[PDB]
Amino acid sequence: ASKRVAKELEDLQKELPKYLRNLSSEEDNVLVWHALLLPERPPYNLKAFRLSISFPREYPFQPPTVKFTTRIYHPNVDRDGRVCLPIISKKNWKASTRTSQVLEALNMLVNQPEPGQPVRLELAEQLTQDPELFDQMAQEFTLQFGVDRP
Amino acid sequence: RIQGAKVLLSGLQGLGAEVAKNLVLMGVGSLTLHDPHPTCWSDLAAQFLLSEQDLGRSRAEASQKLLAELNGAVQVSVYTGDITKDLLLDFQVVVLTASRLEEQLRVGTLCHEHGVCFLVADTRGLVGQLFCDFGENFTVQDPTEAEPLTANIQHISQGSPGILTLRHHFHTGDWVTFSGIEGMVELNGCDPRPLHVREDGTLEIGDTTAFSCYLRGGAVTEVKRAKTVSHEPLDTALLQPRVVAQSAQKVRARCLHQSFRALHKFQQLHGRPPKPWDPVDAEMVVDLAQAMGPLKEQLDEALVRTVALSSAGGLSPMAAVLGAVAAQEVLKAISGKFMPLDQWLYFDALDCLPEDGDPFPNPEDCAPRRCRYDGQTAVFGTNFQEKLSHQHYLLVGAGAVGCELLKSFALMGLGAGDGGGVTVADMDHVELSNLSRQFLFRSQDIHRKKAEVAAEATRRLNADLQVTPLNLQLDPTTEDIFGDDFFSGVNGVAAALDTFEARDYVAARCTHFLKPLLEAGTMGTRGSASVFIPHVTENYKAPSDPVCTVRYIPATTEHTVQWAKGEFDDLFCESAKTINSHPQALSSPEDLVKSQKQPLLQTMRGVLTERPQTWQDCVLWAFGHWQLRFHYGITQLLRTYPPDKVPFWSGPKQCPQPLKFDASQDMHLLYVLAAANLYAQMHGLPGSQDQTALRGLLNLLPLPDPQNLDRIFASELELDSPSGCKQLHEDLKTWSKGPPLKPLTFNFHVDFVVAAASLRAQNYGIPVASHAETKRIVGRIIPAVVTTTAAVAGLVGLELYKVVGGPRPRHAFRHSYLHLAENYFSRWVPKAPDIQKFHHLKWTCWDRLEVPAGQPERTLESLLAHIQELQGLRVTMLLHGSALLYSAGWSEEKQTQHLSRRVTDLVKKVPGQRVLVLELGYEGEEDDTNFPRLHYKL
Amino acid sequence: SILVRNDKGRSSPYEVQLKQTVAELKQQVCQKERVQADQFWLSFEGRPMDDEHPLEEYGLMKGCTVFMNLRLRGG
């Protein structure tokens, strides 16, 4: 399974999407990727977020796990960094899909939160009822702990 | 229910031993053995209960003790007299093995006349005959293996035949009952009603004009109706055999039936069985078979002759398979469950014989020699036994199938001689739940290693073979022991694993080492046995929920069970370790902010701020957490997502409702009891089971309202800020003293999760899991049956016969799938490995490329050039498992740096490794193409 | 139109063509019986059916029966 992951890492490193930077593996384990996601939403764009993509030994059939190393104040990201992306769900992950589509969906999730898919329900309630305070707290939290923009 | 049925068992050959073992292990409370015939050497090759010491002694009398030791709760007895009517009437099921045809007819006529269930089981070499006779009218109550499929109602329509809306499958004419119905309180436990199916997915339940309006909830479960089964007596079934088989195998089974009838005629006319592989006796059997005429189509005389020649033996795998089937039929008769065999079952295993062009064993080659294996050499010969004694086999998994395989190996004599042996590898210990599902364990074996106990028991079955126990599993972490030097002596692998992942790993290792892998698997009454032979058959192909939905909207029973299990894990196992690991979070909020552990600590602190002092004080915490989880949280969810949210609670999703506490109810009381007992056992406080005193305390000091918890419980918006962690540390300043909390690894373990699952299921309207279902889901215990275990082990042994028999064509080997609950048994020839084609390359799942490193190790460029000229394709990618040694997509400098290096300078040198498995990708490769691995040899 | 006997012992009708491959029938069984594809296989008259092959090569007559067989975890 590692060879497919290496091919995907190659086709991504040779042409990175604009919203990703510094994609690299551990050079003895291609099944784990490290990246610096570059958000574009007004609150999140002030900082860059470290990201880890873990590929299981059963990767072609089992979806990879996306996890934020840098803590992010988001409704759809758990407090340990787990991302509840629909494409990597066990329900509809299909072998024909690729990590490029996964990162496209992740970029759209970070740039367009959908509160109807809660992970941190209190953050979703804050977003829907007083979105101005959600924006204020999210900007404060991302500025407090965030990687410098490369 | 099975304890009330008494079983008579005549014939104590290896087949009778298998039947008796299965019946005793399952726990049929009473069994009587009958075999006055003295023990002979022809029985020691299949009878695990008997040894060479009891020669001359009756088989039943000597085997009674060994049967009793298997299950002390079973009354194993011996009857030394004749099988008369008076003896017969004392039993509900009577099994005949090793019985002559006249005796079979005499017993069967009486059994049919007097309502006694009658079974005949016999094995003649590689052929097995089973006959059932369960009476003119036998009621089968549960003709389905699985539990009835419960479902839940969304709406109910009254008046003319009512329309049912549901949140499952149904059939016209099915009878269903209703439970947990609100509004229609009279429908709870009512008599079953007929059902009809419409094209739009709704169901009709007939007249419901007088019933009230639907309120909420409601569950519907179909009732498995009973069926009548009629069986003809053996006196007539011999002339019209209703053998269960596919349309292709009806004629072959019919010819085996006629062959058995001819063998019985031979026994009547000559007074002895045919001499092993005697052409004269085989020809006489054939003449008798052709004299009977067609059954009420031409007879296969070659099949009859082969059966006659091979019939002179008794084989351990055949005994295991046929006795497993017969024991399952006995249990069907005793308990009324499942569908019995129609009339007959014939099992053909003649594939184990040598090929047509190969020399068949001589008449004097199979003559008895006063040895354990006289029942085996009577069909396979003596040189086959000598080659069997030289086999060194890795058995992976010492479980139930592994123990039955060990029994089979000891009876076969596999590893008896020099150079041969068995290695049994298992890490797990003998739990009490492992007893009574397998015969290899007793009380003195509890919590000792499975491999060691199995080795000792197999040595007791046969002292000849060297069974070596290794207490290590077989996974990537144990490569140092199960390396190349280990597999150099190993001739094959027998797999009785508990998981698909271990099967996948052992199959990969078997493919790597070119070792024949026999694989055995079970679930319920379903079993499979597969054989994967290198360069002949295919490889083993293994099969493959997030907190995102489980935390706020559980749609299924598995979701609620997982939520309850995680709640138990973080309330009783994880957060205690978090407290005990580092006291820094309990002394400095600055590090507490960084540690990110506030919510678990806050919910462990509970509604209380002080440490609980007594049981009557600690009991408040349980129902405080009950109010927090089941009332406050769902209130927050409802206020965040209103019922008319833009509605959101539509389709599969429905609006939930908060739970109101009531001590008089069973579920709330059980939840409080289990939670309080678990907390007390963690904290060191004394647990208690006084439900009356606990409910008195509950109704004496209840909380005034559940909304005030805002003053004690901080929101997720606030616990991540200093304002929350500061007051959390202020509250917890007293919790850092005293002994640490004891984690409770999953006593009230089951009760807590059962109560939580029931509450959640009634909250969200999903079906409520039973105690057994909850235990199965949360403990991952496998539904297993001893009969399927024995049958699958016998099939694996049958394939082992062909594996040891040297080179064989693909048509010789068989894969087998059996489902006893519905009389399904299929043996099919496995397909050849699929030819993968890529331009001029053709390869299968076994192929590889072997390249030497050389006395001076070649550079990576040398290897790539060699592979390019060998295959005709340029290597664009090269990895070692997961480390990328080379890729053509790289920049020039990195490519040249890696090409100049040696392979062993790019990968870690595993100690003792001689073969490196490297993964290759070539130019123009289609996606996911698995090219042959390079076995780079040092 | 054929019957597929699922794991739970219930025969469910399906509509399928002779030229239709076993893969489509398997996926229909997956969506109707809510079971993942890799965990079961199909058999006709005892003979297992491969996904790549079509129905014509396995002789599925009109109104015939096909059995699902689960891959077994172990024991």
Ligand SMILES: Nc1ncnc2c1ncn2[C@@H]1O[C@H](COP(=O)(O)O)[C@@H](O)[C@H]1O
């Ligand atoms: N990778 C493995 N290597 C060796 N033994 C195993 C492995 N996986 C499971 N087993 C054992 O195989 C047995 C199978 O369980 P059962 O067949 O239910 O008794 C259990 O005793 C497991 O501990």
